[PDB]
């Protein structure tokens, strides 16, 4: 046996509430880390003004959560480095800038409606 890479302190506590209505759900493509250049199709779910992506539609357990209430979603620039079209990325101008591509232009726009708005702090 070998332990480690676990951690011994709680800094942030975020999780999809059990009694929280699903805002919007849909299969999206999450860009890979700076390392490998590729896309990884996963199940995206918006709940509690927050984004939650699961390995599959099963939604067994939240793999990673990202606060949108502190971001400004917006369609990728006309000079972005994304081959696929109808893409959208969110930036918080302090932490980082996430990206999300869409198969059709109808899904992208629709997503921005929920994400973009849910992001606003006003």
């Amino acid at each position: 046996g070998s332990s480690g890479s676990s951690g011994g302190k709680r800094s942030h506590s975020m999780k999809r509430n059990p009694n929280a209505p699903v805002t919007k759900a849909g299969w999206l493509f999450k860009q890979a880390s700076s390392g490998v250049k590729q896309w990884n199709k996963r199940w995206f779910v918006l709940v509690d003004r927050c984004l939650f992506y699961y390995k599959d539609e099963k939604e067994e357990s939240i793999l990673g959560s990202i606060p949108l209430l502190s971001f400004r979603v917006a369609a990728v620039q006309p000079s972005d480095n994304i081959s696929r079209k109808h893409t959208f990325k969110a930036e918080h101008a302090g932490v980082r800038t996430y990206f999300f591509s869409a198969e059709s232009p109808e899904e992208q726009e629709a997503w921005i409606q929920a994400m973009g708005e849910a992001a606003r702090v006003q």
Side-chain angles (χ1 to χ4, degrees), residues 27-52:
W27 283 94
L28 277 167
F29 289 67
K30 189 163 189 286
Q31 210 210 71
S33 76
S34 166
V36 63
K37 295 274 204 271
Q38 72 172 103
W39 290 88
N40 292 249
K41 193 202 176 61
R42 293 270 155 83
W43 185 236
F44 270 51
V45 180
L46 189 74
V47 165
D48 207 70
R49 204 151 296 196
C50 293
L51 208 156
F52 308 124

mmCIF file with all atom_site columns, all heavy atoms in Angstrom, residues 27-52:
data_model
loop_
_atom_site.group_PDB
_atom_site.id
_atom_site.type_symbol
_atom_site.label_atom_id
_atom_site.label_alt_id
_atom_site.label_comp_id
_atom_site.label_asym_id
_atom_site.label_entity_id
_atom_site.label_seq_id
_atom_site.pdbx_PDB_ins_code
_atom_site.Cartn_x
_atom_site.Cartn_y
_atom_site.Cartn_z
_atom_site.occupancy
_atom_site.B_iso_or_equiv
_atom_site.pdbx_formal_charge
_atom_site.auth_seq_id
_atom_site.auth_comp_id
_atom_site.auth_asym_id
_atom_site.auth_atom_id
_atom_site.pdbx_PDB_model_num
ATOM 1   N N   . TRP A 1 27 ? -24.202 17.448 -23.069 1.00 0.00 ? 27 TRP A N   1
ATOM 2   C CA  . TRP A 1 27 ? -22.878 16.916 -23.369 1.00 0.00 ? 27 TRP A CA  1
ATOM 3   C C   . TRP A 1 27 ? -22.012 17.965 -24.057 1.00 0.00 ? 27 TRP A C   1
ATOM 4   O O   . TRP A 1 27 ? -22.334 18.429 -25.153 1.00 0.00 ? 27 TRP A O   1
ATOM 5   C CB  . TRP A 1 27 ? -22.992 15.672 -24.252 1.00 0.00 ? 27 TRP A CB  1
ATOM 6   C CG  . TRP A 1 27 ? -23.398 14.442 -23.498 1.00 0.00 ? 27 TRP A CG  1
ATOM 7   C CD1 . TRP A 1 27 ? -24.666 13.958 -23.341 1.00 0.00 ? 27 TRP A CD1 1
ATOM 8   C CD2 . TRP A 1 27 ? -22.533 13.544 -22.795 1.00 0.00 ? 27 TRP A CD2 1
ATOM 9   N NE1 . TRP A 1 27 ? -24.640 12.812 -22.583 1.00 0.00 ? 27 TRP A NE1 1
ATOM 10  C CE2 . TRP A 1 27 ? -23.344 12.536 -22.237 1.00 0.00 ? 27 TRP A CE2 1
ATOM 11  C CE3 . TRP A 1 27 ? -21.153 13.490 -22.585 1.00 0.00 ? 27 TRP A CE3 1
ATOM 12  C CZ2 . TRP A 1 27 ? -22.819 11.490 -21.482 1.00 0.00 ? 27 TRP A CZ2 1
ATOM 13  C CZ3 . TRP A 1 27 ? -20.633 12.452 -21.836 1.00 0.00 ? 27 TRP A CZ3 1
ATOM 14  C CH2 . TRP A 1 27 ? -21.463 11.463 -21.294 1.00 0.00 ? 27 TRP A CH2 1
ATOM 15  N N   . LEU A 1 28 ? -20.913 18.337 -23.409 1.00 0.00 ? 28 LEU A N   1
ATOM 16  C CA  . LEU A 1 28 ? -20.001 19.333 -23.961 1.00 0.00 ? 28 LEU A CA  1
ATOM 17  C C   . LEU A 1 28 ? -18.586 18.774 -24.067 1.00 0.00 ? 28 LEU A C   1
ATOM 18  O O   . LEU A 1 28 ? -18.285 17.709 -23.528 1.00 0.00 ? 28 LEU A O   1
ATOM 19  C CB  . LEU A 1 28 ? -20.001 20.591 -23.090 1.00 0.00 ? 28 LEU A CB  1
ATOM 20  C CG  . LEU A 1 28 ? -21.134 21.586 -23.348 1.00 0.00 ? 28 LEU A CG  1
ATOM 21  C CD1 . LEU A 1 28 ? -21.204 22.615 -22.230 1.00 0.00 ? 28 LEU A CD1 1
ATOM 22  C CD2 . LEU A 1 28 ? -20.946 22.269 -24.695 1.00 0.00 ? 28 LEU A CD2 1
ATOM 23  N N   . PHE A 1 29 ? -17.719 19.502 -24.765 1.00 0.00 ? 29 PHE A N   1
ATOM 24  C CA  . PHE A 1 29 ? -16.334 19.080 -24.941 1.00 0.00 ? 29 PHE A CA  1
ATOM 25  C C   . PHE A 1 29 ? -15.389 19.966 -24.135 1.00 0.00 ? 29 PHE A C   1
ATOM 26  O O   . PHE A 1 29 ? -15.250 21.158 -24.411 1.00 0.00 ? 29 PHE A O   1
ATOM 27  C CB  . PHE A 1 29 ? -15.951 19.120 -26.422 1.00 0.00 ? 29 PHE A CB  1
ATOM 28  C CG  . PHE A 1 29 ? -16.609 18.047 -27.241 1.00 0.00 ? 29 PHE A CG  1
ATOM 29  C CD1 . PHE A 1 29 ? -17.980 18.051 -27.440 1.00 0.00 ? 29 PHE A CD1 1
ATOM 30  C CD2 . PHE A 1 29 ? -15.856 17.032 -27.811 1.00 0.00 ? 29 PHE A CD2 1
ATOM 31  C CE1 . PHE A 1 29 ? -18.589 17.065 -28.193 1.00 0.00 ? 29 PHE A CE1 1
ATOM 32  C CE2 . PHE A 1 29 ? -16.458 16.044 -28.565 1.00 0.00 ? 29 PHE A CE2 1
ATOM 33  C CZ  . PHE A 1 29 ? -17.827 16.059 -28.756 1.00 0.00 ? 29 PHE A CZ  1
ATOM 34  N N   . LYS A 1 30 ? -14.741 19.376 -23.137 1.00 0.00 ? 30 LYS A N   1
ATOM 35  C CA  . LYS A 1 30 ? -13.808 20.109 -22.290 1.00 0.00 ? 30 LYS A CA  1
ATOM 36  C C   . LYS A 1 30 ? -12.379 19.969 -22.806 1.00 0.00 ? 30 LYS A C   1
ATOM 37  O O   . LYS A 1 30 ? -11.843 18.863 -22.881 1.00 0.00 ? 30 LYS A O   1
ATOM 38  C CB  . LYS A 1 30 ? -13.892 19.605 -20.848 1.00 0.00 ? 30 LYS A CB  1
ATOM 39  C CG  . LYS A 1 30 ? -13.113 20.456 -19.859 1.00 0.00 ? 30 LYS A CG  1
ATOM 40  C CD  . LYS A 1 30 ? -13.540 20.179 -18.428 1.00 0.00 ? 30 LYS A CD  1
ATOM 41  C CE  . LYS A 1 30 ? -12.933 21.184 -17.461 1.00 0.00 ? 30 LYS A CE  1
ATOM 42  N NZ  . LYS A 1 30 ? -11.484 20.928 -17.232 1.00 0.00 ? 30 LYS A NZ  1
ATOM 43  N N   . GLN A 1 31 ? -11.769 21.096 -23.159 1.00 0.00 ? 31 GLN A N   1
ATOM 44  C CA  . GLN A 1 31 ? -10.402 21.097 -23.667 1.00 0.00 ? 31 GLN A CA  1
ATOM 45  C C   . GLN A 1 31 ? -9.442  20.493 -22.647 1.00 0.00 ? 31 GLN A C   1
ATOM 46  O O   . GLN A 1 31 ? -9.642  20.621 -21.440 1.00 0.00 ? 31 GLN A O   1
ATOM 47  C CB  . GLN A 1 31 ? -9.966  22.522 -24.015 1.00 0.00 ? 31 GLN A CB  1
ATOM 48  C CG  . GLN A 1 31 ? -8.955  22.589 -25.147 1.00 0.00 ? 31 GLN A CG  1
ATOM 49  C CD  . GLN A 1 31 ? -8.020  23.776 -25.025 1.00 0.00 ? 31 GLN A CD  1
ATOM 50  O OE1 . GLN A 1 31 ? -7.157  23.813 -24.148 1.00 0.00 ? 31 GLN A OE1 1
ATOM 51  N NE2 . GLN A 1 31 ? -8.187  24.755 -25.906 1.00 0.00 ? 31 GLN A NE2 1
ATOM 52  N N   . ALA A 1 32 ? -8.399  19.834 -23.142 1.00 0.00 ? 32 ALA A N   1
ATOM 53  C CA  . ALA A 1 32 ? -7.407  19.211 -22.275 1.00 0.00 ? 32 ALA A CA  1
ATOM 54  C C   . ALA A 1 32 ? -6.434  20.248 -21.722 1.00 0.00 ? 32 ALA A C   1
ATOM 55  O O   . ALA A 1 32 ? -6.385  21.382 -22.196 1.00 0.00 ? 32 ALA A O   1
ATOM 56  C CB  . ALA A 1 32 ? -6.654  18.125 -23.028 1.00 0.00 ? 32 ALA A CB  1
ATOM 57  N N   . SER A 1 33 ? -5.661  19.850 -20.716 1.00 0.00 ? 33 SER A N   1
ATOM 58  C CA  . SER A 1 33 ? -4.692  20.745 -20.096 1.00 0.00 ? 33 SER A CA  1
ATOM 59  C C   . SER A 1 33 ? -3.625  21.170 -21.100 1.00 0.00 ? 33 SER A C   1
ATOM 60  O O   . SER A 1 33 ? -3.434  20.523 -22.130 1.00 0.00 ? 33 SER A O   1
ATOM 61  C CB  . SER A 1 33 ? -4.035  20.066 -18.893 1.00 0.00 ? 33 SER A CB  1
ATOM 62  O OG  . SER A 1 33 ? -3.075  19.111 -19.308 1.00 0.00 ? 33 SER A OG  1
ATOM 63  N N   . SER A 1 34 ? -2.932  22.261 -20.792 1.00 0.00 ? 34 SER A N   1
ATOM 64  C CA  . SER A 1 34 ? -1.886  22.776 -21.667 1.00 0.00 ? 34 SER A CA  1
ATOM 65  C C   . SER A 1 34 ? -1.031  21.638 -22.220 1.00 0.00 ? 34 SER A C   1
ATOM 66  O O   . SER A 1 34 ? -0.556  21.697 -23.353 1.00 0.00 ? 34 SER A O   1
ATOM 67  C CB  . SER A 1 34 ? -1.003  23.772 -20.913 1.00 0.00 ? 34 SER A CB  1
ATOM 68  O OG  . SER A 1 34 ? 0.192   24.036 -21.626 1.00 0.00 ? 34 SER A OG  1
ATOM 69  N N   . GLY A 1 35 ? -0.840  20.602 -21.407 1.00 0.00 ? 35 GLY A N   1
ATOM 70  C CA  . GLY A 1 35 ? -0.043  19.466 -21.830 1.00 0.00 ? 35 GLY A CA  1
ATOM 71  C C   . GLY A 1 35 ? -0.496  18.905 -23.164 1.00 0.00 ? 35 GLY A C   1
ATOM 72  O O   . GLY A 1 35 ? -0.158  19.442 -24.219 1.00 0.00 ? 35 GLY A O   1
ATOM 73  N N   . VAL A 1 36 ? -1.262  17.819 -23.117 1.00 0.00 ? 36 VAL A N   1
ATOM 74  C CA  . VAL A 1 36 ? -1.761  17.184 -24.331 1.00 0.00 ? 36 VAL A CA  1
ATOM 75  C C   . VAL A 1 36 ? -2.801  18.059 -25.023 1.00 0.00 ? 36 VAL A C   1
ATOM 76  O O   . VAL A 1 36 ? -3.678  18.629 -24.374 1.00 0.00 ? 36 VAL A O   1
ATOM 77  C CB  . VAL A 1 36 ? -2.383  15.808 -24.029 1.00 0.00 ? 36 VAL A CB  1
ATOM 78  C CG1 . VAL A 1 36 ? -3.590  15.955 -23.116 1.00 0.00 ? 36 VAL A CG1 1
ATOM 79  C CG2 . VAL A 1 36 ? -2.765  15.101 -25.321 1.00 0.00 ? 36 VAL A CG2 1
ATOM 80  N N   . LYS A 1 37 ? -2.697  18.161 -26.343 1.00 0.00 ? 37 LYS A N   1
ATOM 81  C CA  . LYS A 1 37 ? -3.629  18.964 -27.124 1.00 0.00 ? 37 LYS A CA  1
ATOM 82  C C   . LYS A 1 37 ? -4.748  18.099 -27.694 1.00 0.00 ? 37 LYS A C   1
ATOM 83  O O   . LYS A 1 37 ? -4.567  17.423 -28.706 1.00 0.00 ? 37 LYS A O   1
ATOM 84  C CB  . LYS A 1 37 ? -2.891  19.677 -28.260 1.00 0.00 ? 37 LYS A CB  1
ATOM 85  C CG  . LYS A 1 37 ? -1.879  20.702 -27.780 1.00 0.00 ? 37 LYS A CG  1
ATOM 86  C CD  . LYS A 1 37 ? -2.527  22.055 -27.538 1.00 0.00 ? 37 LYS A CD  1
ATOM 87  C CE  . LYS A 1 37 ? -1.513  23.184 -27.633 1.00 0.00 ? 37 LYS A CE  1
ATOM 88  N NZ  . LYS A 1 37 ? -0.863  23.459 -26.321 1.00 0.00 ? 37 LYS A NZ  1
ATOM 89  N N   . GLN A 1 38 ? -5.904  18.128 -27.039 1.00 0.00 ? 38 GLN A N   1
ATOM 90  C CA  . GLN A 1 38 ? -7.053  17.347 -27.482 1.00 0.00 ? 38 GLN A CA  1
ATOM 91  C C   . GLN A 1 38 ? -8.300  17.712 -26.684 1.00 0.00 ? 38 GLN A C   1
ATOM 92  O O   . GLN A 1 38 ? -8.228  18.458 -25.708 1.00 0.00 ? 38 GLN A O   1
ATOM 93  C CB  . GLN A 1 38 ? -6.763  15.851 -27.343 1.00 0.00 ? 38 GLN A CB  1
ATOM 94  C CG  . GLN A 1 38 ? -6.740  15.367 -25.901 1.00 0.00 ? 38 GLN A CG  1
ATOM 95  C CD  . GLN A 1 38 ? -6.649  13.858 -25.794 1.00 0.00 ? 38 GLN A CD  1
ATOM 96  O OE1 . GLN A 1 38 ? -5.588  13.308 -25.500 1.00 0.00 ? 38 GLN A OE1 1
ATOM 97  N NE2 . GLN A 1 38 ? -7.765  13.180 -26.031 1.00 0.00 ? 38 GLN A NE2 1
ATOM 98  N N   . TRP A 1 39 ? -9.442  17.181 -27.106 1.00 0.00 ? 39 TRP A N   1
ATOM 99  C CA  . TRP A 1 39 ? -10.706 17.451 -26.430 1.00 0.00 ? 39 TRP A CA  1
ATOM 100 C C   . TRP A 1 39 ? -11.250 16.190 -25.769 1.00 0.00 ? 39 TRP A C   1
ATOM 101 O O   . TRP A 1 39 ? -11.071 15.084 -26.277 1.00 0.00 ? 39 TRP A O   1
ATOM 102 C CB  . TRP A 1 39 ? -11.730 18.004 -27.423 1.00 0.00 ? 39 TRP A CB  1
ATOM 103 C CG  . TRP A 1 39 ? -11.418 19.395 -27.886 1.00 0.00 ? 39 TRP A CG  1
ATOM 104 C CD1 . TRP A 1 39 ? -10.630 19.750 -28.943 1.00 0.00 ? 39 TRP A CD1 1
ATOM 105 C CD2 . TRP A 1 39 ? -11.886 20.617 -27.304 1.00 0.00 ? 39 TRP A CD2 1
ATOM 106 N NE1 . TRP A 1 39 ? -10.580 21.118 -29.054 1.00 0.00 ? 39 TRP A NE1 1
ATOM 107 C CE2 . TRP A 1 39 ? -11.343 21.673 -28.061 1.00 0.00 ? 39 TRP A CE2 1
ATOM 108 C CE3 . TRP A 1 39 ? -12.713 20.922 -26.219 1.00 0.00 ? 39 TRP A CE3 1
ATOM 109 C CZ2 . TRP A 1 39 ? -11.599 23.010 -27.765 1.00 0.00 ? 39 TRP A CZ2 1
ATOM 110 C CZ3 . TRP A 1 39 ? -12.966 22.247 -25.926 1.00 0.00 ? 39 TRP A CZ3 1
ATOM 111 C CH2 . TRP A 1 39 ? -12.412 23.278 -26.697 1.00 0.00 ? 39 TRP A CH2 1
ATOM 112 N N   . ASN A 1 40 ? -11.916 16.364 -24.632 1.00 0.00 ? 40 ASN A N   1
ATOM 113 C CA  . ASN A 1 40 ? -12.486 15.238 -23.900 1.00 0.00 ? 40 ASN A CA  1
ATOM 114 C C   . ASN A 1 40 ? -13.975 15.453 -23.646 1.00 0.00 ? 40 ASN A C   1
ATOM 115 O O   . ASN A 1 40 ? -14.362 16.229 -22.772 1.00 0.00 ? 40 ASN A O   1
ATOM 116 C CB  . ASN A 1 40 ? -11.753 15.043 -22.572 1.00 0.00 ? 40 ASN A CB  1
ATOM 117 C CG  . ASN A 1 40 ? -10.323 14.579 -22.763 1.00 0.00 ? 40 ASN A CG  1
ATOM 118 O OD1 . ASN A 1 40 ? -9.977  13.443 -22.435 1.00 0.00 ? 40 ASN A OD1 1
ATOM 119 N ND2 . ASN A 1 40 ? -9.482  15.457 -23.297 1.00 0.00 ? 40 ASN A ND2 1
ATOM 120 N N   . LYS A 1 41 ? -14.808 14.760 -24.415 1.00 0.00 ? 41 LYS A N   1
ATOM 121 C CA  . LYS A 1 41 ? -16.254 14.872 -24.274 1.00 0.00 ? 41 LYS A CA  1
ATOM 122 C C   . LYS A 1 41 ? -16.710 14.351 -22.915 1.00 0.00 ? 41 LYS A C   1
ATOM 123 O O   . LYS A 1 41 ? -16.405 13.219 -22.540 1.00 0.00 ? 41 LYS A O   1
ATOM 124 C CB  . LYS A 1 41 ? -16.958 14.098 -25.390 1.00 0.00 ? 41 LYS A CB  1
ATOM 125 C CG  . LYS A 1 41 ? -18.441 14.408 -25.505 1.00 0.00 ? 41 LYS A CG  1
ATOM 126 C CD  . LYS A 1 41 ? -19.192 13.289 -26.205 1.00 0.00 ? 41 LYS A CD  1
ATOM 127 C CE  . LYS A 1 41 ? -20.690 13.554 -26.231 1.00 0.00 ? 41 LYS A CE  1
ATOM 128 N NZ  . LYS A 1 41 ? -21.018 14.809 -26.962 1.00 0.00 ? 41 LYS A NZ  1
ATOM 129 N N   . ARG A 1 42 ? -17.442 15.184 -22.182 1.00 0.00 ? 42 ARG A N   1
ATOM 130 C CA  . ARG A 1 42 ? -17.939 14.807 -20.865 1.00 0.00 ? 42 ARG A CA  1
ATOM 131 C C   . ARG A 1 42 ? -19.337 15.373 -20.630 1.00 0.00 ? 42 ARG A C   1
ATOM 132 O O   . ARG A 1 42 ? -19.815 16.210 -21.394 1.00 0.00 ? 42 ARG A O   1
ATOM 133 C CB  . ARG A 1 42 ? -16.987 15.303 -19.776 1.00 0.00 ? 42 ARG A CB  1
ATOM 134 C CG  . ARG A 1 42 ? -15.636 14.608 -19.786 1.00 0.00 ? 42 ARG A CG  1
ATOM 135 C CD  . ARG A 1 42 ? -15.640 13.369 -18.903 1.00 0.00 ? 42 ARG A CD  1
ATOM 136 N NE  . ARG A 1 42 ? -14.638 12.394 -19.326 1.00 0.00 ? 42 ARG A NE  1
ATOM 137 C CZ  . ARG A 1 42 ? -13.357 12.458 -18.978 1.00 0.00 ? 42 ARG A CZ  1
ATOM 138 N NH1 . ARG A 1 42 ? -12.925 13.446 -18.206 1.00 0.00 ? 42 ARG A NH1 1
ATOM 139 N NH2 . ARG A 1 42 ? -12.507 11.531 -19.402 1.00 0.00 ? 42 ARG A NH2 1
ATOM 140 N N   . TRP A 1 43 ? -19.986 14.909 -19.568 1.00 0.00 ? 43 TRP A N   1
ATOM 141 C CA  . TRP A 1 43 ? -21.329 15.368 -19.232 1.00 0.00 ? 43 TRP A CA  1
ATOM 142 C C   . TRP A 1 43 ? -21.275 16.604 -18.341 1.00 0.00 ? 43 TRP A C   1
ATOM 143 O O   . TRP A 1 43 ? -20.758 16.554 -17.224 1.00 0.00 ? 43 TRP A O   1
ATOM 144 C CB  . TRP A 1 43 ? -22.111 14.255 -18.533 1.00 0.00 ? 43 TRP A CB  1
ATOM 145 C CG  . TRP A 1 43 ? -23.540 14.615 -18.257 1.00 0.00 ? 43 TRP A CG  1
ATOM 146 C CD1 . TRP A 1 43 ? -24.170 14.598 -17.046 1.00 0.00 ? 43 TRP A CD1 1
ATOM 147 C CD2 . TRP A 1 43 ? -24.515 15.043 -19.214 1.00 0.00 ? 43 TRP A CD2 1
ATOM 148 N NE1 . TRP A 1 43 ? -25.479 14.991 -17.191 1.00 0.00 ? 43 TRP A NE1 1
ATOM 149 C CE2 . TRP A 1 43 ? -25.715 15.269 -18.511 1.00 0.00 ? 43 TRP A CE2 1
ATOM 150 C CE3 . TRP A 1 43 ? -24.491 15.260 -20.594 1.00 0.00 ? 43 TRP A CE3 1
ATOM 151 C CZ2 . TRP A 1 43 ? -26.878 15.700 -19.145 1.00 0.00 ? 43 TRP A CZ2 1
ATOM 152 C CZ3 . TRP A 1 43 ? -25.646 15.687 -21.221 1.00 0.00 ? 43 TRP A CZ3 1
ATOM 153 C CH2 . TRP A 1 43 ? -26.827 15.904 -20.497 1.00 0.00 ? 43 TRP A CH2 1
ATOM 154 N N   . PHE A 1 44 ? -21.811 17.712 -18.841 1.00 0.00 ? 44 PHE A N   1
ATOM 155 C CA  . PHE A 1 44 ? -21.822 18.963 -18.089 1.00 0.00 ? 44 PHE A CA  1
ATOM 156 C C   . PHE A 1 44 ? -23.189 19.202 -17.454 1.00 0.00 ? 44 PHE A C   1
ATOM 157 O O   . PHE A 1 44 ? -24.226 18.945 -18.067 1.00 0.00 ? 44 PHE A O   1
ATOM 158 C CB  . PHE A 1 44 ? -21.460 20.135 -19.002 1.00 0.00 ? 44 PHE A CB  1
ATOM 159 C CG  . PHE A 1 44 ? -19.985 20.414 -19.062 1.00 0.00 ? 44 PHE A CG  1
ATOM 160 C CD1 . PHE A 1 44 ? -19.084 19.398 -19.337 1.00 0.00 ? 44 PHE A CD1 1
ATOM 161 C CD2 . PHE A 1 44 ? -19.500 21.694 -18.843 1.00 0.00 ? 44 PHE A CD2 1
ATOM 162 C CE1 . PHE A 1 44 ? -17.727 19.653 -19.391 1.00 0.00 ? 44 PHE A CE1 1
ATOM 163 C CE2 . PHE A 1 44 ? -18.144 21.955 -18.896 1.00 0.00 ? 44 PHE A CE2 1
ATOM 164 C CZ  . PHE A 1 44 ? -17.256 20.933 -19.173 1.00 0.00 ? 44 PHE A CZ  1
ATOM 165 N N   . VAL A 1 45 ? -23.183 19.697 -16.220 1.00 0.00 ? 45 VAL A N   1
ATOM 166 C CA  . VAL A 1 45 ? -24.421 19.972 -15.500 1.00 0.00 ? 45 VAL A CA  1
ATOM 167 C C   . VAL A 1 45 ? -24.311 21.259 -14.690 1.00 0.00 ? 45 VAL A C   1
ATOM 168 O O   . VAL A 1 45 ? -23.361 21.447 -13.929 1.00 0.00 ? 45 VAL A O   1
ATOM 169 C CB  . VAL A 1 45 ? -24.790 18.814 -14.554 1.00 0.00 ? 45 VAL A CB  1
ATOM 170 C CG1 . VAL A 1 45 ? -26.080 19.122 -13.810 1.00 0.00 ? 45 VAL A CG1 1
ATOM 171 C CG2 . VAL A 1 45 ? -24.912 17.511 -15.331 1.00 0.00 ? 45 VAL A CG2 1
ATOM 172 N N   . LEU A 1 46 ? -25.288 22.142 -14.859 1.00 0.00 ? 46 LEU A N   1
ATOM 173 C CA  . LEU A 1 46 ? -25.303 23.413 -14.143 1.00 0.00 ? 46 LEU A CA  1
ATOM 174 C C   . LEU A 1 46 ? -26.311 23.382 -12.999 1.00 0.00 ? 46 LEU A C   1
ATOM 175 O O   . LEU A 1 46 ? -27.519 23.303 -13.223 1.00 0.00 ? 46 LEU A O   1
ATOM 176 C CB  . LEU A 1 46 ? -25.637 24.557 -15.102 1.00 0.00 ? 46 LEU A CB  1
ATOM 177 C CG  . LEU A 1 46 ? -25.490 25.971 -14.537 1.00 0.00 ? 46 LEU A CG  1
ATOM 178 C CD1 . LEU A 1 46 ? -24.021 26.349 -14.423 1.00 0.00 ? 46 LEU A CD1 1
ATOM 179 C CD2 . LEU A 1 46 ? -26.235 26.973 -15.406 1.00 0.00 ? 46 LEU A CD2 1
ATOM 180 N N   . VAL A 1 47 ? -25.806 23.447 -11.771 1.00 0.00 ? 47 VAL A N   1
ATOM 181 C CA  . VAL A 1 47 ? -26.663 23.430 -10.591 1.00 0.00 ? 47 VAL A CA  1
ATOM 182 C C   . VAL A 1 47 ? -26.147 24.388 -9.523  1.00 0.00 ? 47 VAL A C   1
ATOM 183 O O   . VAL A 1 47 ? -24.944 24.467 -9.274  1.00 0.00 ? 47 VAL A O   1
ATOM 184 C CB  . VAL A 1 47 ? -26.762 22.015 -9.990  1.00 0.00 ? 47 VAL A CB  1
ATOM 185 C CG1 . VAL A 1 47 ? -27.339 22.071 -8.583  1.00 0.00 ? 47 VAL A CG1 1
ATOM 186 C CG2 . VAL A 1 47 ? -27.601 21.115 -10.884 1.00 0.00 ? 47 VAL A CG2 1
ATOM 187 N N   . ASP A 1 48 ? -27.065 25.114 -8.895  1.00 0.00 ? 48 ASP A N   1
ATOM 188 C CA  . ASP A 1 48 ? -26.704 26.067 -7.851  1.00 0.00 ? 48 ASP A CA  1
ATOM 189 C C   . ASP A 1 48 ? -25.727 27.111 -8.385  1.00 0.00 ? 48 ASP A C   1
ATOM 190 O O   . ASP A 1 48 ? -24.652 27.315 -7.819  1.00 0.00 ? 48 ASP A O   1
ATOM 191 C CB  . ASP A 1 48 ? -26.089 25.339 -6.656  1.00 0.00 ? 48 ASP A CB  1
ATOM 192 C CG  . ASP A 1 48 ? -26.292 26.088 -5.354  1.00 0.00 ? 48 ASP A CG  1
ATOM 193 O OD1 . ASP A 1 48 ? -27.445 26.146 -4.878  1.00 0.00 ? 48 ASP A OD1 1
ATOM 194 O OD2 . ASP A 1 48 ? -25.300 26.617 -4.811  1.00 0.00 ? 48 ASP A OD2 1
ATOM 195 N N   . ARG A 1 49 ? -26.107 27.768 -9.475  1.00 0.00 ? 49 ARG A N   1
ATOM 196 C CA  . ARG A 1 49 ? -25.264 28.789 -10.085 1.00 0.00 ? 49 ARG A CA  1
ATOM 197 C C   . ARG A 1 49 ? -23.819 28.309 -10.192 1.00 0.00 ? 49 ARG A C   1
ATOM 198 O O   . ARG A 1 49 ? -22.885 29.110 -10.161 1.00 0.00 ? 49 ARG A O   1
ATOM 199 C CB  . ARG A 1 49 ? -25.323 30.083 -9.271  1.00 0.00 ? 49 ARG A CB  1
ATOM 200 C CG  . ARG A 1 49 ? -24.985 31.326 -10.078 1.00 0.00 ? 49 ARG A CG  1
ATOM 201 C CD  . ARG A 1 49 ? -25.704 32.553 -9.539  1.00 0.00 ? 49 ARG A CD  1
ATOM 202 N NE  . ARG A 1 49 ? -27.153 32.438 -9.667  1.00 0.00 ? 49 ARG A NE  1
ATOM 203 C CZ  . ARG A 1 49 ? -27.985 33.468 -9.554  1.00 0.00 ? 49 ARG A CZ  1
ATOM 204 N NH1 . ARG A 1 49 ? -27.512 34.683 -9.312  1.00 0.00 ? 49 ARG A NH1 1
ATOM 205 N NH2 . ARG A 1 49 ? -29.292 33.284 -9.684  1.00 0.00 ? 49 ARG A NH2 1
ATOM 206 N N   . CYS A 1 50 ? -23.645 26.998 -10.317 1.00 0.00 ? 50 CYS A N   1
ATOM 207 C CA  . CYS A 1 50 ? -22.315 26.410 -10.427 1.00 0.00 ? 50 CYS A CA  1
ATOM 208 C C   . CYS A 1 50 ? -22.282 25.339 -11.512 1.00 0.00 ? 50 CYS A C   1
ATOM 209 O O   . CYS A 1 50 ? -23.308 24.743 -11.844 1.00 0.00 ? 50 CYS A O   1
ATOM 210 C CB  . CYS A 1 50 ? -21.887 25.809 -9.088  1.00 0.00 ? 50 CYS A CB  1
ATOM 211 S SG  . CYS A 1 50 ? -21.618 27.033 -7.783  1.00 0.00 ? 50 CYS A SG  1
ATOM 212 N N   . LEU A 1 51 ? -21.097 25.099 -12.064 1.00 0.00 ? 51 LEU A N   1
ATOM 213 C CA  . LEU A 1 51 ? -20.930 24.100 -13.114 1.00 0.00 ? 51 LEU A CA  1
ATOM 214 C C   . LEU A 1 51 ? -20.350 22.807 -12.548 1.00 0.00 ? 51 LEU A C   1
ATOM 215 O O   . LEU A 1 51 ? -19.441 22.834 -11.718 1.00 0.00 ? 51 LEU A O   1
ATOM 216 C CB  . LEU A 1 51 ? -20.021 24.640 -14.218 1.00 0.00 ? 51 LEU A CB  1
ATOM 217 C CG  . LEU A 1 51 ? -20.255 24.071 -15.618 1.00 0.00 ? 51 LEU A CG  1
ATOM 218 C CD1 . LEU A 1 51 ? -19.760 25.042 -16.679 1.00 0.00 ? 51 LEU A CD1 1
ATOM 219 C CD2 . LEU A 1 51 ? -19.567 22.722 -15.767 1.00 0.00 ? 51 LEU A CD2 1
ATOM 220 N N   . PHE A 1 52 ? -20.880 21.677 -13.004 1.00 0.00 ? 52 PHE A N   1
ATOM 221 C CA  . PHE A 1 52 ? -20.415 20.375 -12.544 1.00 0.00 ? 52 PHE A CA  1
ATOM 222 C C   . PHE A 1 52 ? -20.351 19.381 -13.701 1.00 0.00 ? 52 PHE A C   1
ATOM 223 O O   . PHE A 1 52 ? -21.362 19.090 -14.340 1.00 0.00 ? 52 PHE A O   1
ATOM 224 C CB  . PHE A 1 52 ? -21.336 19.838 -11.446 1.00 0.00 ? 52 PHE A CB  1
ATOM 225 C CG  . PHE A 1 52 ? -21.555 20.809 -10.321 1.00 0.00 ? 52 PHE A CG  1
ATOM 226 C CD1 . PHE A 1 52 ? -22.837 21.190 -9.958  1.00 0.00 ? 52 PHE A CD1 1
ATOM 227 C CD2 . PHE A 1 52 ? -20.481 21.340 -9.627  1.00 0.00 ? 52 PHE A CD2 1
ATOM 228 C CE1 . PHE A 1 52 ? -23.043 22.083 -8.924  1.00 0.00 ? 52 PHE A CE1 1
ATOM 229 C CE2 . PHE A 1 52 ? -20.679 22.233 -8.591  1.00 0.00 ? 52 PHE A CE2 1
ATOM 230 C CZ  . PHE A 1 52 ? -21.963 22.604 -8.238  1.00 0.00 ? 52 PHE A CZ  1
#
